[PDB]
Amino acid sequence: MSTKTKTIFDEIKAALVLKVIDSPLGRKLIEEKAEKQVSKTQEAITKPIEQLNKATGQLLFSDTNKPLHNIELEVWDRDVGTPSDYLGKGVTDQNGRFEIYYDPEKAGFKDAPDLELRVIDNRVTFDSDNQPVYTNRIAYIIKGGDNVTQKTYDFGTLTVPYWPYDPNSPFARIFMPNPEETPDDYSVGRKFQAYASANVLTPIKAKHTIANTLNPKEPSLTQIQADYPPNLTINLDREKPGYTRSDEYFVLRVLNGMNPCLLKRSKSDPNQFKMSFIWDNYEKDTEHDLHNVEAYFVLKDGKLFPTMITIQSRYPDSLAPHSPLKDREVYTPNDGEKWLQAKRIFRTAALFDGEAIEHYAKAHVQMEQYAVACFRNLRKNPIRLMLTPHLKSIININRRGDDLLVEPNLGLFVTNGPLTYPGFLQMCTEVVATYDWKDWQPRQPICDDHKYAKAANLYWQILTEYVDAFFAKHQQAIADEWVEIRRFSEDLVEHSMPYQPIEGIMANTDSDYEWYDTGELDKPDLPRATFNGKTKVIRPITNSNQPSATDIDNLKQCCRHIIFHTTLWHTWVNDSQSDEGGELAYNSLALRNGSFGSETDPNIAPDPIEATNQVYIFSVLNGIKYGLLVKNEDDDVPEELRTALLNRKDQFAELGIDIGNIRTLINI
C-alpha cells in the first residue's frame, strides 16, 4: 500500500511540528509575530501649514472600486537600506480622497523625500477607566515618487486590496489563499490554547492512525474510546448505566442538544410533533448509509415523549440524488433493540445535519459575510466598536476549515459524513441562500424542559436592552457617520448569495405539519432587493446617507442578529460537540453496512481511522476555549453588554447555564 508509508510519515510530521510550536521556540516566534504587526502611532505634525508640504490622492477598493472611506493614511520616506522616516498623518474622506500634510524635513539625511504611502488599520481596546485605546496596524503600502520637491505631490486614484472578497466562493468570504497573511489574526492566547490542546490530543490520533495501517480492523472502538478522555454521555452512563440511551434523554437532546431541533407541529393535533431529515436531494458517498429518518413526538402535560421513528434508507447503490429507496420502516418505543437502533440512526442524521447546517453553514458561513463587510466599512461609526469584537477572527477559522472540516477529500464533515463533498456543499449553499437578518427572532419554548428556547429568548432580551442602550448613547455619532452604515449595507447585499427559496432537507414537504415557530425562518413575503440581475438573500439596512426610524431599527435588528449568532448560538452548537458526539457508540456523523445492529458492532460504526478522527476533532474543537464575554480576555467587549449579561447571571443559572461559558466570537 502506497498510502501507508506516507500516512505514517505524515502523522509523525504533524506530531513533531506540534512539538516545535508548543515550546519556547514556537511561543517566541508567535509572540514576536504578534508584536511586529503593531504600528507605532505617530504624533500630529504641529508646525505652520504653509511651511509644510502636501500629498493628495484618492483610494478605492481593488474589487468594488468604491471609495476606501475614513481610513488612516501615513506619509513616510522610504529609503533603501535605511530605516523609513515618518513625515505626516491624515485620513481619507467619504470619497476616499485625501490631502495629507507632511514635512520633508524629517528626511534629515537627504535633500528630498522619496515618498511612500501607508494605509493604516486599527483595533479599539478599552483601558482601565473604560476609555478607547487605538492600536494601529499597517494595512497596505504604496510606492510614490522619488526626489519629491513639489509642494504638492499627487498619487491620483489608486486601488487598495483591503479585505477583498473571494470571487471563487459561492459565499461572501475574504480572499485569503495564504492564511498566514490574514488582516485579522487570532490573539496569542487563542493560538497558545490551540497548539496546547492539539499537542495533548494529536499523539493519540497519530497512535491510532499508525496502528490502523498495521491492521485495518485495529485499533478497536473500545481502545480508541479509552485512549481519549470521556465525554458527557460516557460520564452519565458511568453514574447511571444506560441513561443516555433512554427516551427521556433522547427527547432532551432533540430539544436542547448540539442540533436543537426546531420541531414541526401538526395542524390538526397540536399535541403531535415531528422532525424530518430527508436526503433525497443529495449525493451519497460509497462507504456510508443514508437514512431519511423522521421522529414523531407527543406532548402530554408539558412533557415530550417519542411516539415513533420512521426510517427509509438508500440502497448501497443509490448514490445520486433521487435514487431508489428501500421500503420505509416504522419503529415504536416497544420494538426493543430496533427501537434503540432507530434512535441512534436519528441521532447520527441529527449530528451530521447539525454540523453541516446548524454549525458550519448557519454560524460560520453566514457570519463571515457580516465580518468582511463590517471590517470593510465600519471605522468612524460607533457601531464598529459594537460589532468588530464579535466578528473578529472568524475569517481565520473558516479559512482553516477549508482544509480541516470541508476540504473536498480530507475534511471531517465530508469524509465522516454520508455525503460526497458536492452533497455537503449543496446543503450549505441551500440554507445560506435563505439566511437574512430581518424580522429574525429566536424560537419560543415548547415546554418547561425546552432549555435552549428559554436560554435563547433570555439572551435575546439582553441583546435588545444592550442594542437599544448603545444606539441611544452614540446616536449623534451613529447618525453623523451613517454613510459607513450605507456602504456596509451595500457590501452585504451586493456580495450575498442570490436568494433561493428553501429546498432540500430543511424544506417542509408535509401538508399536515408546519414549523411550530417561524421567527427564525425565512420570510419570503418580505421584499428583498436585486443586484446584478438577481434577487439577493441579504436585505438592505439602508439606502440613504442619513438615518431614519426604519433604517435605525433595521440596523438594530441586524446587530442583534450578528451578536446572537456570533456569541450564544455558535457557543451552543460548538461547545455541544463533545456532549453529542464524543462517544462513538452513542453517536457519529454516519453509519455503515446497514446501520442496524448492536452499538458495539464495529462494522456498523465508523472504521478505526474515522472513529479516532471523529473523537479527536470534537475534543479539539470544544477543547479550545479562548474569547468569552464575561472573561473579556481581549478587553474589547463594550461594558454595557457585559453588565447586561452579568445582571442576568442567576436566571441563566436556573437553566443550568454559566454566562461565563458564553463565547464572544467565532474563532473555533
Q: Select 574 or 587, whichever has its Cβ closest to Fe ion.
A: 574
| Closest residue by beta carbon to Na ion | 285
CB of 355 to Na ion, least distance (A): 12
- Do the annotations mark residue 450 as ligand-binding? no
**Nearest CA-CA partner of 136 in 359, 379, 330:** 379
**Nearest CA-CA partner of 287 in 553, 520, 603:** 603
CB of 424 to Fe ion, least distance (A): 16
Stretch that binds Na ion, among 51-59, 199-207, 279-287, 450-458 (CB under 5 A): 279-287
Q: Select 72 or 283, whichever has its Cβ closest to Na ion.
A: 283
Q: Select 483 or 620, whichever has its Cβ closest to Fe ion.
A: 620
Integer CA distances (angstroms), 101 to 92, 183, 428, in order: 12, 27, 50
Stretch that binds Na ion, among 35-43, 136-144, 173-181, 285-293 (CB under 5 A): 285-293
- Do the annotations mark residue 291 as ligand-binding? no
Site string for Fe ion, 560-579 (x = CB under 5 A): --------------x-----
Q: Select 369 or 574, whichever has its Cβ closest to Fe ion.
A: 574
CB of 120 to Na ion, least distance (A): 45
CB-based contacts of 288: which residues, under 8 Å, 6+ apart?
A: 417, 418, 590, 591, 592
CB of 17 to Na ion, least distance (A): 27
What's the distance, CA 111 to chain centroid?
Answer: 52
CB of 352 to Na ion, least distance (A): 10
- Do the annotations mark residue 668 as ligand-binding? yes
Q: Based on the shown chain and the rule CB under 5 A, indicate whether residue 285 belongs to the binding site for Na ion.
A: yes
Stretch that binds Na ion, among 164-172, 278-286, 543-551, 557-565 (CB under 5 A): 278-286
Q: Select 73 or 363, whichever has its Cβ closest to Fe ion.
A: 363
Q: Which residues from 127-156 bind Fe ion, rule CB under 5 A?
A: none
Task: Quote the CA–CA distance of 606 and 618 in Å, as a whole number.
Answer: 15
β-strands 72-79, 82-91: how paired? antiparallel
CB of 427 to Na ion, least distance (A): 12
| Closest residue by beta carbon to Fe ion | 574
Q: Judge whether 211 and 608 are in contact, CB under 8 Å.
A: yes
Q: Select 68 or 621, whichever has its Cβ closest to Fe ion.
A: 621
Number of residues near Fe ion (by CB under 5 A): 1
Q: Which residues from 39-98 bind Na ion, rule CB under 5 A?
A: none
Stretch that binds Na ion, among 40-48, 220-228, 280-288, 376-384 (CB under 5 A): 280-288
Task: Quote the CA–CA distance of 176 and 399 in Å, as a whole number.
Answer: 7
Q: Select 356 or 541, whichever has its Cβ closest to Na ion.
A: 356
SS (H, E, C) 258-284: CCCCCCEEECCCCCEEEEEECCCCCCE
Q: Select 276 or 574, whichever has its Cβ closest to Fe ion.
A: 574
CB of 590 to Na ion, least distance (A): 7
At residue 501's C-alpha, the angle toward residues 497 and 506, to 5°, is 100
Q: Select 120 or 456, whichever has its Cβ closest to Fe ion.
A: 456
Q: Based on the shown chain and the rule CB under 5 A, indicate whether residue 587 belongs to the binding site for Fe ion.
A: no
**Binds 285: which of Fe ion, Na ion, none (CB < 5-8 Å by kind):** Na ion
**Nearest CA-CA partner of 371 in 463, 485, 477, 492:** 492
**Binds 583: which of Fe ion, Na ion, none (CB < 5-8 Å by kind):** none
DSSP label at residue 419: B
SS (H, E, C) 570-635: HHHHHCCHHHHHCCCCCCCCCCECCCCCCCCCCCCCCCHHHHHHHHHHHHHHHHCCCCECCCCCCC
**Binds 574: which of Na ion, Fe ion, none (CB < 5-8 Å by kind):** Fe ion
At residue 198's C-alpha, the angle toward residues 194 and 200, to 5°, is 125
Torsion, Cα of 210, 215, 221, 226 (10° steps): -50
**Binds 116: which of Fe ion, Na ion, none (CB < 5-8 Å by kind):** none
CB atoms within 10 A of CB 337: 11
Residue bearing cell 456569541: 567
| Per-position b or e across 93-124, b if 16+ CB within 10 A of its CB | eeebebebbbbbeeeeeeeebbbbbbbbbbbe
Q: Select 574 or 576, whichever has its Cβ closest to Fe ion.
A: 574
Number of residues near Na ion (by CB under 5 A): 1
CB of 311 to Fe ion, least distance (A): 29
Q: Which residues from 266-325 bind Fe ion, rule CB under 5 A?
A: none
Integer CA distances (angstroms), 44 to 49, 125, 513, in order: 12, 21, 66
**Binds 522: which of Na ion, Fe ion, none (CB < 5-8 Å by kind):** none
Q: Judge whether 495 and 373 are in contact, CB under 8 Å.
A: yes
Q: Judge whether 284 and 318 are in contact, CB under 8 Å.
A: yes
Residue bearing cell 510550536: 21
- Do the annotations mark residue 570 as ligand-binding? yes
Q: Would you say the C-alpha torsion 28, 30, 33, 34 has a positive or negative sign?
A: negative
Binding interface with Fe ion (CB under 5 A): 574
Binding region for Fe(2+): 359, 364, 570, 668
Binding region: 359, 364, 570, 668
Binding interface with Na ion (CB under 5 A): 285
